[PDB]
Design a protein around this ligand. Sequence first.
Ligand code: HEC
Ligand code: HEC
Ligand code: HEC
Ligand code: HEC
Length: 108
Amino acid sequence: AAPKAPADGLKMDKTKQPVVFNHSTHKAVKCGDCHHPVNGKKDYQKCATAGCHDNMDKKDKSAKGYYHAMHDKGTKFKSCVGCHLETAGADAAKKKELTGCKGSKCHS
Ligand code: HEC
Ligand code: HEC
Ligand code: HEC
Ligand code: HEC
């Protein structure tokens, strides 16, 4: 069938700063804006699959840079932090919760 959203509490732990991803709080976002087209087909593999966002150099800005794909603005698909910046706006509490580098819902 079509793929279904997994349960909440999925740990992204390619790095030393792992982050929990909950589908239940992202239902306002289409599946394909994250599980984005690759060669025109939505791809539901893990983001850091080899040949995907598998460069663990957090300084890399190419599409393969994992850090880059999770944190930067101006990306072809919204990143976690990019979309959250737009969502938080001028609301300082939401900026901390959604975009803070520490003491946020991504990074404790
Ligand atoms: C403020 C601008 C932030 C700073 C600085 C960093 N983060 Fe994040 N972050 C997010 C994800 C999805 C990951 C990957 C989790 C995993 O698979 O382990 C990370 C990872 C990091 C790391 C580790 C990089 C390395 O390779 O060691 C650093 C240094 C880091 N981040 C700093 C997600 C999020 C997120 C959710 C929306 C927010 C608000 C932030 N990150 C914020 C920052
Ligand atoms: C971005 C905000 C997303 C939206 C919208 C949806 N998903 Fe998602 N999903 C996302 C992440 C960051 C993760 C973890 C990937 C990681 O690399 O571990 C996932 C994972 C899943 C999975 C499991 C994939 C795997 O481990 O094999 C699937 C099947 C899944 N997601 C499905 C899916 C559906 C069908 C969506 C729409 C209803 C959907 N996702 C939305 C990020 C995001
Ligand atoms: C491999 C099959 C992939 C998987 C699984 C995911 N991504 Fe991806 N991503 C991939 C390619 C080949 C590219 C470039 C496509 C092209 O048109 O240039 C991207 C692009 C991104 C971007 C934009 C990066 C930029 O503009 O520099 C982001 C933000 C991104 N991808 C995020 C993302 C996430 C969150 C994923 C897991 C849910 C994910 N991608 C999977 C290849 C692959
Ligand atoms: C927009 C296109 C989004 C993308 C890409 C990602 N997120 Fe998100 N997120 C978004 C919304 C609209 C909301 C709700 C905001 C509110 O005020 O609560 C969120 C929420 C979060 C949260 C907090 C809720 C929770 O699940 O505990 C976290 C921790 C979260 N989002 C993480 C996250 C990650 C790790 C992403 C990239 C893989 C990601 N978000 C993408 C919208 C959007």
